[model samples]
Target: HMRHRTLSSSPALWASIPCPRSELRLDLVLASGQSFRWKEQSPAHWSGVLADQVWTLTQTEDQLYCTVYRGDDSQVSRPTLEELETLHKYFQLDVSLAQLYSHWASVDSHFQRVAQKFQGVRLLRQDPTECLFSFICSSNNNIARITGMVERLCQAFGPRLIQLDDVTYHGFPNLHALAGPEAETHLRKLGLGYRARYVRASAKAILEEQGGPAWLQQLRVAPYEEAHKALCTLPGVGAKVADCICLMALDKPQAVPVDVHVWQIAHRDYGWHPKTSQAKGPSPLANKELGNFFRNLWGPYAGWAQAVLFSADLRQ
Candidate 1:
């Protein structure tokens, strides 16, 4: 259960964290598909939520320094070492991007050029509940709007968080917040549109009807297809969104999320198509076929490959 608390008067809130062994290119990682909440303030400085705290982080060659604040406005303070650890775990800083890219190069030649551009990219380890609900909004939408909708959810149902300058950022609400009695009406007012239904129903199904966070957490150890299967049982989740939560949240690097653009990229550039083709095979079936085709082609790191290619495709 989530309990609200006031900020401590301790000095830990203003502290900075530096990971001397990390190589992070903040620009590529933040804008990439792995997360939607992070916003760049200037150059390498960023502000976002991590473990219910609003943090301002500055990126360096080998470290990300951070400061913490409270409520809508508070004095700047150092983050406790524990909070810094949360940041470290959130970014998956221990995973060597260099080694990952090297492995990709040896296995797939098409990866080198595009992968090099995203050398700083790392899959963010997000809260499974938030990841699931966020991707629900992602359907039939663009990045900017998805970001807005999520913030609105936080602003409406979530407890108030930090205020930096004139802007305020709230923690993404917990299951209790969204599963509350008034959640549906409030979410619609927050402008979730039809996706609001999915979010509301999903909250009730996961937290009240079925198993809670632990159930979703357990999917991490299950086989990829099994996890995908269970996720499909949710209201708004489909093959693509399920794979997104699988890849970024559940430590399944092999899950490749295929959408219309990626589908077109597969057909036009990579010559991938459904077995029965458009006229014969159902379009939905064909989409899954392409996902299977690429997952088989790229092997274990297929999700990473897809992310890089998708980013490259969008940029061009």
Candidate 2:
């Protein structure tokens, strides 16, 4: 089922979440087929794809409710208006719309000429662990291939949701479900290649350093340098991936996740490169440059800025 939501892009407010922030992609992680990312209020009140459709929940005064929007209203199943309002409140949709648009506009204008080069754009923010795993699968892989890889990982290592209405869905696996390399070996069959090891090691490293998803709680308040350094300590995480995770996951506003895509945008367009790193294999300006680069180029809205360029670059 297909559904279109016309939003102002503003209404941008953030929920002060604790752990699940490490797992779920709050900023709309939908790609092509998986319209809904599955929802659960801490394993007990778990709710996902009630009837072969993804649900968007909203909060209400009494209890949480959900609305199953899959474009086929004829076959729709809604929980309760209270649930729909519950999710809307959970996302703070009422408060965040304008704020999101304000930041989006700030970065969008910065790329006025740069973005004109690309079309078919969709930039998504992701949960830290999930984002980390997703990009790890992206090494040298095409977008379509990456898309398949990510979707397959959810089907395999991720958790299985209760079956309902002949359709089943699962939430991305947590650290416990990861279990280590041997646990994720099944992913190799799904086309992850060497990245399977990276995924395994990454999940392990999270417990080693940060304690658990609970540890991610402090990253938002920690200094940006400390967060970036800590992220690099992971098996396969680097500056680009770390910045993306920090900003999108930990809410480190103004973080620019530099990748080969953004590297070209910064260099070919705005000349936003380091004075020394030109053509050098380890050049600071080669898209991996974080820290000040993020603050200076994207300003307070660097996270949002990177989204515009990276999303726009996907088209080109």
Against the true structure, whose lDDT is highest? Answer: 1
Relative to the true structure, candidate 1 reaches a TM of 0.86
* TM-score, candidate number 2: 0.65
Clashes per candidate (backbone, < 3 Å) = 8, 26
Give a tens-digit lDDT track for model 2, residues 85-166. Answer: 4444333333332344454556556665543443222223344566667666766777677767766777776656434444
In model 2, the worst 10-residue window by lDDT is: 5-14
Off by over 4 Å in 2: 1-29, 32-53, 56-66, 69-110, 113-125, 162-167, 276-294
| TM, every model | 0.86, 0.65
Candidate 1 lowest-lDDT run of ten: 1-10
How far out, in Å, is residue 57 in model 2? 9.8
For residue 305, what is the lDDT in candidate 2? 50
Candidate 1 residue-wise lDDT, 1-316, digit = tens? 2111122323354454565422466666676756777887555566677767776666556656677665544554567677778888887777776777787777667777667666666677888888999899999998888989988888887777756566677778877777777888888888888998899888888886667878888887888899999999999999889999999888898888877788777777777657755653337677777777877777787787687787677677
State which candidate has the highest TM-score: 1
